[PDB]
Amino acid sequence: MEDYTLREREQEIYNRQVIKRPFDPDSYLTADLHLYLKNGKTLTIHIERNLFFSHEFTWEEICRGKCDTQEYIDGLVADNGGRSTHNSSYLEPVAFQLTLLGNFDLGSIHLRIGDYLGFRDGQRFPCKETIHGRRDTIGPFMQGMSGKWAKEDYIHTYSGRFDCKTSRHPSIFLAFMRANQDGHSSFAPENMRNALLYSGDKSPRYILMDNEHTLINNFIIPRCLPYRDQYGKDY
Amino acid sequence: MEDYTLREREQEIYNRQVIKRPFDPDSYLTADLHLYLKNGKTLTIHIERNLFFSHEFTWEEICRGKCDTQEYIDGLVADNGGRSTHNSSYLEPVAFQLTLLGNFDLGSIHLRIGDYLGFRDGQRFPCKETIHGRRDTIGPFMQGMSGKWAKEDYIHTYSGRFDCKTSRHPSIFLAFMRANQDGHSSFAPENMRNALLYSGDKSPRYILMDNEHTLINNFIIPRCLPYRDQYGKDY
Amino acid sequence: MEDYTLREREQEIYNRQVIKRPFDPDSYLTADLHLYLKNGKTLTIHIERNLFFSHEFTWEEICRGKCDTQEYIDGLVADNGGRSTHNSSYLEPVAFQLTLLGNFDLGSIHLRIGDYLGFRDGQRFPCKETIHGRRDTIGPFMQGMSGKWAKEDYIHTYSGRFDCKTSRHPSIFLAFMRANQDGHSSFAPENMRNALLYSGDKSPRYILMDNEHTLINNFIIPRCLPYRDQYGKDY
Ligand SMILES: Nc1ncnc2c1ncn2[C@@H]1O[C@H](COP(=O)(O)OP(=O)(O)OP(=O)(O)O)[C@@H](O)[C@H]1O
Ligand SMILES: Nc1ncnc2c1ncn2[C@@H]1O[C@H](COP(=O)(O)OP(=O)(O)OP(=O)(O)O)[C@@H](O)[C@H]1O
Ligand SMILES: Nc1ncnc2c1ncn2[C@@H]1O[C@H](COP(=O)(O)OP(=O)(O)OP(=O)(O)O)[C@@H](O)[C@H]1O
Ligand SMILES: Nc1ncnc2c1ncn2[C@@H]1O[C@H](COP(=O)(O)OP(=O)(O)OP(=O)(O)O)[C@@H](O)[C@H]1O
Ligand SMILES: Nc1ncnc2c1ncn2[C@@H]1O[C@H](COP(=O)(O)OP(=O)(O)OP(=O)(O)O)[C@@H](O)[C@H]1O
Ligand SMILES: Nc1ncnc2c1ncn2[C@@H]1O[C@H](COP(=O)(O)OP(=O)(O)OP(=O)(O)O)[C@@H](O)[C@H]1O
Ligand SMILES: [Mg+2]
Ligand SMILES: [Mg+2]
Ligand SMILES: [Mg+2]
Ligand SMILES: [Mg+2]
Ligand SMILES: [Mg+2]
Ligand SMILES: [Mg+2]
Ligand SMILES: [Mg+2]
Ligand SMILES: [Mg+2]
Ligand SMILES: [Mg+2]
């Protein structure tokens, strides 16, 4: 019989290479910020970076992906300072899920949800603000998952609603960095050239799906990404 | 009497903590580039960063915040190379004010106003250009101010017109860095991870106000930012 | 006679200063990514940076510079997952030319052409991807040129089509760094402040020309940039 062939041994080694690839320092960290929309559609901000990412997604970036929009924004910019007839935008998301596939340094993950002008935790003066907020380092709150990548340590999910605890009309700061358990830094003087040369790969993608089911089958599953659906099931 | 209570002593200390917070290395540097528009409205580019900022705002970013616009741009891109019927855009600003609240290294502030393609000081060949221009390091030209933050050393204002000395149809490069009077660098090998992790917080905001009075009362005053109005009065 | 005057000696020295200026570490590296469009127009992405550049141009950035566009994008995002009636976009480019004027480190030039989501070389899983691709480091494949800058070593051109070998509906990652033949790094701890302070100058420009002839005479020639026209002639 061919019950334990050299062909099969080779595959087994290749399986391990594939499963451990996220730990490869020249791989990507993959983060997906899923935003759940008022018409039941999903908007996924898909980000891949080798080493680090730091970007604040504006209300405009989140809501797309005229004078009426402007009048509305006026009211988000200044309390009681706009002439809009509606309290909230049809285009704002109602909930979110941040999911990760990569060797992330969990202590480096920042998710700060603020108002239109990026004010978070009710702290509304530029002079009082700092880069370290209350609801900010979500690392400890990220759950593990089963699904395709069950039993690995490089998938994590965190979700919530856009309610008054954070903001109902949001901008969202997201940052993260790749883990390093070894002594030599990838930001060391020897490596800064590379940290910056590859800093732009890739640009965030804004992916609209007709509903969560469509998101799962047209993107999550075929791209082999982790995901927790609204019923709690991990893929 | 309660003429000098422990309650009041505590407040006094808190006042000092607040007043000195801009010096806190985990605070934000706040810069506002106010642009004065041809319909009397104001467009404020509001920027907060912990450590550094470097971005060239394009004509498109400044003028927003079709084929007619394109024909016009053609003429800015190449002398006498476009078919537009107008000499300038209704959407271009006529004057500007850069104001700062933060422990800025004044020698690090660059404001370079160029034409559509970012050519400054009449130097129009990419091969001749450098990152150091004539009208560029505005530090020495920044004035102090009174107003809310009178008697502090971390507010500064600089203004001017968009005329032929710089450009009447502008793009604008703005960079700055936080001061450091101490020996250990925030770009040191130990700190580069952080310099880049927080580099994106926050995104620039583009804030449109109906007029300068509205800007002052709906944004400057309630956000506790410094500002010099068109009559020279500091807030 | 005035056959060899001090006036002429001065000019000769100035000619050398000008010709060698690209080697000046405070000059710009200039890169132009020319994209050739289906209506015969050209779109030039014009980039100048002092030290490094790293950005992935999205399909949206390339194609500009509604529900129909969305339905089309759906199909690029997921195989057979969109309802569009057309196979390709009228707005996609058909070929490209990357040309450089600057003291580029040729080993630092990355040009990775991927599909809508930035997948390159047929590798379509985020977990399998790395920052080093097959068709990626184009340095060795860049040709020298004659034209204005004949006999210099700081001009290079590389071109190709957007076909199935790369992608017919592309996003494009472009990175590069300035050469350094000396011992002290411009990313060294002493210099990181500067590497980042000037990192944003300039923003990429998206320049539309009516045809290649117009591109050459309205931009290439008067800006003194190198260029190879469709007949192989260098300017
Ligand atoms: N001195 C204090 N004693 C008790 N509670 C406080 C005190 N200061 C703030 N809090 C409470 O802490 C919570 C968060 O307040 P906040 O985020 O404004 O923090 P803070 O300590 O006041 O910081 P800052 O000086 O930047 O305003 C609020 O519930 C607030 O009432
Ligand atoms: N190359 C690596 N770099 C960083 N971490 C690693 C690497 N290889 C393994 N690890 C860590 O060790 C853990 C276990 O690895 P591995 O799967 O090889 O062991 P195992 O015997 O199958 O036991 P386990 O049930 O923990 O997987 C991984 O989940 C990962 O967090
Ligand atoms: N050799 C020179 N002698 C006197 N004036 C000069 C000389 N070169 C330039 N200038 C003057 O200096 C001013 C600025 O010129 P410009 O910004 O082009 O500087 P530059 O010294 O010529 O630099 P570059 O070599 O980059 O062109 C102009 O008024 C110009 O006439
Ligand atoms: N923690 C700090 N970091 C950096 N600079 C500081 C710090 N504290 C004070 N300074 C500098 O010293 C100046 C004076 O500080 P302070 O207000 O404590 O002194 P003062 O006795 O009230 O006199 P002054 O009239 O200068 O304020 C400040 O304006 C500031 O520029
Ligand atoms: N073990 C192998 N033996 C022979 N050819 C291979 C092998 N693996 C891949 N190839 C071939 O190499 C070419 C490129 O494949 P690909 O880019 O997927 O590289 P790869 O080595 O399989 O990397 P990865 O493990 O990331 O998929 C293809 O023509 C493929 O058929
Ligand atoms: N300052 C510099 N920094 C970096 N490289 C330089 C510098 N000066 C010259 N070189 C390199 O040396 C080459 C030749 O320089 P130069 O033109 O001064 O010599 P030449 O005698 O005219 O011979 P050639 O025919 O090589 O030009 C240049 O093409 C360039 O690549
Ligand atoms: Mg292999
Ligand atoms: Mg408080
Ligand atoms: Mg395991
Ligand atoms: Mg306190
Ligand atoms: Mg000159
Ligand atoms: Mg004082
Ligand atoms: Mg000179
Ligand atoms: Mg393979
Ligand atoms: Mg020579």
Numbering used by the authors:
A (entry chain A), B (entry chain A), C (entry chain A): 1 to 65, 79 to 248
The authors write:
Cypoviruses, members of the family Reoviridae, subfamily Spinareovirus, possess a single capsid layer with turrets and are commonly embedded in crystalline occlusion bodies called polyhedra, which are formed in the cell cytoplasm and mainly composed of a single virus-encoded protein, polyhedrin. To ensure the delivery of virus particles to the target intestinal cells, allowing the transmission of packages of infectious virus between hosts by oral-faecal routes, polyhedra are disrupted only when they are exposed to the very alkaline pH environment found in insect midguts. The fold of all the polyhedrins is highly similar – a β-barrel core sitting on a base domain, surrounded by a common array of five helices (H1–H5). The strongest intermolecular interactions define a trimer composed of a cluster of three β-barrels sandwiched by helices top and bottom.
CPV15 is like CPV5, but with a smaller clamp, and has a dramatic conformational change in V4. CPV15 is similar to CPV5 however V3 and V2c are shorter, leaving space for two ATPs in different conformations to CPV1: one binds V3 and V2c and the other stacks at the 2-fold axis with the backbone of V4 forming a further layer. The full length polyhedrin structures are generally well ordered, as expected for a crystal lattice which has extensive interactions and low solvent content (19–25%), however some types show regions of flexibility: 13 residues (136–148) of CPV5 and 6 residues (68–73) of CPV14 have high (>40 compared with an overall Wilson B-factor of 21.3) B-factors, whilst 13 residues (66–78) of CPV15 could not be modelled. CPV4 has limited numbers of molecular interactions in this area, while in CPV5 a few strong trimer-trimer interactions are present. In CPV15, 13 disordered residues are situated around this region (indicated by dashed lines in Fig. 5) leaving the trimer contacts apparently weakened. The V5 regions of CPV5, 15, 17 and 19 differ, but all end in a similar place. In CPV1, 14, 15, 17, 18 and 20 solvent molecules can move between these two voids, whereas in CPV4, 5 and 19 they are blocked by tyrosine residues.
